[PDB]
């Protein structure tokens, strides 16, 4: 249903939740990727407050791009995504960090390096099909 | 125009040329990938006679997947692809190797590890839009 790369303007603060439903575009043997980037401007070259990159079946890396430069990457081996299955990815803004849940289970967190109020745009891209994208505020 | 991941059944021998026209789906700053895989069966989990993977603006890796296992990867830093531009990629089957041309210029080669006559399917995927795919025989 949704075009990939997927772009949507967005604002985030404490209590915001970004929810993504989709499925990998390839079998895990072929190592598809998923990337979710919280950008500071509508341009894709803009800074990235929160970068979330899944190499399905292998690892996750999280980072930020600040004044054009990648910072300290955080690596995680948690891999709750299942081969060939739909996933529901939810990214919640807490006061001190993002909490990333996959199919209802807390799987990753990432401390705010830039205030989330700096976010203007979310991009979801790489090797997924995308059926649902929502930003909600509570 | 063409769906990505793109799958097309194919046969290859000496004199075969696979021609791909497309453009990256992201700015090079965001490091999109391109992957071209020559498979031994119609299944995406099948062995890969020739694997060609571009990290736009960084490197290329080439390899083969034989009985399910990746082999010796070949790395190249040649990067003739231009940021934000259409490319024309042509992969020609010579008796002893594949020759990969990008916009008319020979840019990569890869010696046959498996006879090209074992190929049954070509997949073009990752972060590109695809406007043209052809297999031709001379």
From Swiss-Prot, chains A, B:
Q: Which PANTHER family match?
A: GALACTOSIDE-BINDING SOLUBLE LECTIN 13-RELATED, GALECTIN
Keyword Acetylation on entry = yes
Q: How does it assemble?
A: Interacts with CEL.
Tissue expression as described in the entry: Expressed abundantly in the bone marrow. Expressed exclusively by eosinophils and basophils. Not detected in monocytes and neutrophils. Expressed in CD25-positive regulatory T-cells (Treg) (at protein level). Found in intestinal tissue from patients with Celiac disease, expression is directly related to the histological grade of mucosal damage and to the number of eosinophils found in the duodenal lesion (at protein level). Found in sputum of patients with eosinophilic inflammatory diseases such as asthma (at protein level).
Species this chain originates from: Homo sapiens
What does the record's miscellaneous section state? Forms hexagonal bipyramidal crystals, known as Charcot-Leyden crystals, in tissues and secretions from sites of eosinophil-associated inflammation and some myeloid leukemias.
Q: What function is annotated for this protein?
A: Regulates immune responses through the recognition of cell-surface glycans. Essential for the anergy and suppressive function of CD25-positive regulatory T-cells (Treg).
The protein depicted here goes by the name Galectin-10
Residue ranges of domain Galectin in the record: 4-136
